[PDB]
């Protein structure tokens, strides 16, 4: 089982009570989100979805960044290891699909050594899956409003863009 060892947070209110190393290696608090709609997801440069994903990420992200939309990125090699390479080489990734929106260092999002956020965000009310709360594969996303709480979340069948309707009620 999938288990927060300061338990302690199990109540923890908001996204912005936790903090993620930038893909630089730069502690980031999360709290700098405090005010924005944020998408949070786990990418992978070898997946089968890995071109609709970033191509219609770096889009809603080109559109709506000046209505106040953020989107988190965490690599992760959970899913097929399909996120091998390094923080030095996932970046330069992301840069050849001219990403503007910030990108994290690797991290697991299940399992034990789970980054404590995503262990967090799939036991919210709105964050739970369908069968248990585990990422079932890459490019799953949970949108975030203004106060850090998880509103919807969507799973790696849905392409970005789909969430591009629900963005109003937030901003
Ligand atoms: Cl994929």
Not at 90 to 113: L, P, Q
Not at 139 to 161: A, Q, S
Request: with cysteine; net charge positive; hydrophobic share 35%.
């Amino acid at each position: 089982t999938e288990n927060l060892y300061f338990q302690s947070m199990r109540c923890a209110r908001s996204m912005h009570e936790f903090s993620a190393k930038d893909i630089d290696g730069h502690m980031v608090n999360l709290d700098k989100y405090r005010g924005f709609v944020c998408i949070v997801t786990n990418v992978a440069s070898q997946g089968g979805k890995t071109e609709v994903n970033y191509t219609q990420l770096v889009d809603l992200h080109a559109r709506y960044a000046e209505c106040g939309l953020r989107i988190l990125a965490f690599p992760c090699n959970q899913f097929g290891k399909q996120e091998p390479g390094s923080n030095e080489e996932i970046k330069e990734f992301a840069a050849g699909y001219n990403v503007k929106f910030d990108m994290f260092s690797k991290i697991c999002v299940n399992g034990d050594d789970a980054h404590p956020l995503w262990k967090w965000m799939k036991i919210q009310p709105k964050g739970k899956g369908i069968l248990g709360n585990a990422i079932k594969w890459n490019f799953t996303k949970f949108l975030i409003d203004k106060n850090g709480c998880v509103v919807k979340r969507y799973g790696p069948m849905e392409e970005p863009l789909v969430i591009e309707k629900d963005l109003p009620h937030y901003f």
